[PDB]
């Protein structure tokens, strides 16, 4: 086509979606990880995760307001990945890398799994 | 912080949100423009437009499944702007620029209004 493109548009959209999350605006699901609860937008979760994409395209699960993750999933690993989904920023540290990689493999977040594998190989 | 960043994340999120829109997945509102109806995600509309942001943060309007725009709004101008919201690409042409600028001013999409003003000034 003959379109023009606004370079910062996608980043600005994601920044505003994170502002809505921080104010709990139009969040339509609670993700339960052990005792911890995380409010989010189903669409953002689907856009970032192969697991949430499969869950919310399912005719029965698409209507659930509560999703419970596997008890093996670490709440801190999930929190770091949820923050990444809404910001493009991953808080990857020596003390959390194993929990982050395991959670990203479960959530099916291919690019996060790849950088965790590379950072682990380096050490 | 000591975060790492995935450059393509925001663009990949927006691309997936557009894929959900094209398949009509988790769309929660219909925008009526004259006779034409457009299905969309409230969160994406809010992230892109000052008008939708004001509408869906309103305690009564946040629950509406149908929003009717001012009858002066041109359906083609709205369609071009809705496509921009989900792609970062604006189909700006000599024959649509006036309708696009008027719709962007109404929707409060500041960056679109700025490029329309610049393209009009040049001609």
């Amino acid at each position: 086509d003959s379109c023009i493109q606004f370079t910062r548009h996608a980043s600005d959209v994601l920044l505003n979606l994170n502002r809505l999350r921080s104010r709990d605006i139009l969040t339509d699901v609670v993700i339960v990880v052990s005792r911890e609860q995380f409010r989010a937008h189903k669409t953002v979760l689907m856009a970032c995760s192969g697991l949430f994409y499969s869950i919310f395209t399912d005719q029965l699960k698409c209507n659930l307001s509560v999703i419970n993750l596997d008890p093996e999933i670490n709440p801190e690993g999930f929190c770091i990945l949820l923050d990444f989904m809404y910001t493009s920023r991953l808080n990857l540290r020596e003390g959390n890398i194993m929990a982050v990689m395991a959670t990203a493999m479960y959530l099916q977040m291919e690019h996060v799994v790849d950088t965790c594998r590379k950072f682990i190989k380096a050490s | 912080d000591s975060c790492i960043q995935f450059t393509r994340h925001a663009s990949d999120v927006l691309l997936n949100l557009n894929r959900l829109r094209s398949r009509d997945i988790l769309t929660d509102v219909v925008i009526v423009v004259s006779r034409e109806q457009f299905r969309a995600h409230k969160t994406v509309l809010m992230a892109c437009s000052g008008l939708f942001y004001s509408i869906f943060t309103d305690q009564l309007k946040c629950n509406l499944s149908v929003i009717n725009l001012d009858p002066e709004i041109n359906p083609e101008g709205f369609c071009i702007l809705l496509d921009f919201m989900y792609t970062s690409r604006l189909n700006l042409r000599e024959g649509n620029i006036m309708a696009v600028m008027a719709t962007a001013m109404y929707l409060q999409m500041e960056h679109v209004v700025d490029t329309c003003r610049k393209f009009i000034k040049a001609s």
Partner: peptide
């Protein structure tokens, strides 16, 4: 704005 750019030419994509």
């Amino acid at each position: 704005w750019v030419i994509p």
